[PDB]
Amino acid sequence: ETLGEKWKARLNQMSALEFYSYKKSGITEVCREEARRALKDGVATGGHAVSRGSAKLRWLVERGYLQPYGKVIDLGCGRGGWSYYAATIRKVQEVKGYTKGGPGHEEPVLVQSYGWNIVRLKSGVDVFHMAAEPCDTLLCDIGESSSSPEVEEARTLRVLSMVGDWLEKRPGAFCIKVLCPYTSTMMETLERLQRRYGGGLVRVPLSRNSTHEMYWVSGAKSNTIKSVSTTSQLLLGRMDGPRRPVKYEEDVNLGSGTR
Ligand SMILES: C[S@@+](CC[C@H](N)C(=O)[O-])C[C@H]1O[C@@H](n2cnc3c(N)ncnc32)[C@H](O)[C@@H]1O
Numbered sequence: 001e002t003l004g005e006k007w008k009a010r011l012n013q014m015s016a017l018e019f020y021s022y023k024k025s026g027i028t029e030v031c032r033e034e035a036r037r038a039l040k041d042g043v044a045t046g047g048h049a050v051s052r053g054s055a056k057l058r059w060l061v062e063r064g065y066l067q068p069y070g071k072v073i074d075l076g077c078g079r080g081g082w083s084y085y086a087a088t089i090r091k092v093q094e095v096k097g098y099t100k101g102g103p104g105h106e107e108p109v110l111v112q113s114y115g116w117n118i119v120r121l122k123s124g125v126d127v128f129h130m131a132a133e134p135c136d137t138l139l140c141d142i143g144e145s146s147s148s149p150e151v152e153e154a155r156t157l158r159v160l161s162m163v164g165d166w167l168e169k170r171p172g173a174f175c176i177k178v179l180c181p182y183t184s185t186m187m188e189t190l191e192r193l194q195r196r197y198g199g200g201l202v203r204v205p206l207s208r209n210s211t212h213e214m215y216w217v218s219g220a221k222s223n224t225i226k227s228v229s230t231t232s233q234l235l236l237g238r239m240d241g242p243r244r245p246v247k248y249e250e251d252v253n254l255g256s257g258t259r
Contacts, residue, residue, distance in 0.1 A: 045112055049251060
């Protein structure tokens with residue numbers, strides 16, 4: 001049994017109160033109030049982000065974990081935070097996002113932030129049945145949380161295969177969401193993939209304690225087992241002490257105008 005599995009079991013054990021306190025205990029988050037109001041009022045300008053993903057991607061890009069450039073593909077773009085953020089980047093030439101949409105799934109949000117004319121968000125698309133196309137920047141943010149470690153593992157495996165098909169055309173720069181990296185077979189296959197392709201695993205502090213997600217990014221050089229187990233250690237530790245306060249970071253402003 002790995003530390004992440006113990007984390008998972010302990011998480012399932014927790015009460016509603018304890019969970020409510022734990023999910024955000026000590027994490028970093030973004031004040032999305034004004035962005036929510038503006039977006040609800042139909043303000044396409046102002047530079048507001050459509051989701052929190054922008055803040056996540058930002059956190060990585062401003063640390064060299066990846067450097068977006070050229071043709072960008074956003075797999076499971078949802079509302080499209082990653083797509084717009086990437087579209088605000090100089091080296092980036094084209095952004096193509098794809099999400100599932102429909103009931104229960106996010107639809108893209110039409111906003112005119114900076115570089116909105118180079119964005120192209122396509123809903124009603126299941127990337128598992130989609131043919132890969134050559135690109136320079138491979139983004140993927142797929143991985144739905146489940147109470148079952150086995151389910152999360154299987155979902156992660158399917159995702160990793162699907163993105164394997166895309167990485168085979170060989171970017172470049174890439175950011176791939178890994179929901180469940182805390183099981184043995186997962187660390188094994190992630191080691192394997194980290195041999196075949198490059199990159200490493202990074203735990204974004206914007207991620208809530210309720211999820212063990214780490215992002216497999218290109219510009220990172222790390223050991224799988226070590227990074228994962230340290231992440232597990234942290235998420236475990238936050239389940240014992242008092243409630244650590246949240247570090248309220250500022251929301252990202254993507255400005256306006258075209259490119
Ligand atoms: C966690 S959200 C991330 C959204 C985006 N990264 C952002 O920053 O706003 C993942 C989205 O991917 C979509 N999705 C999940 N599986 C998909 C699939 N197989 N094909 C296309 N989209 C999918 C879901 O609808 C979900 O809204």
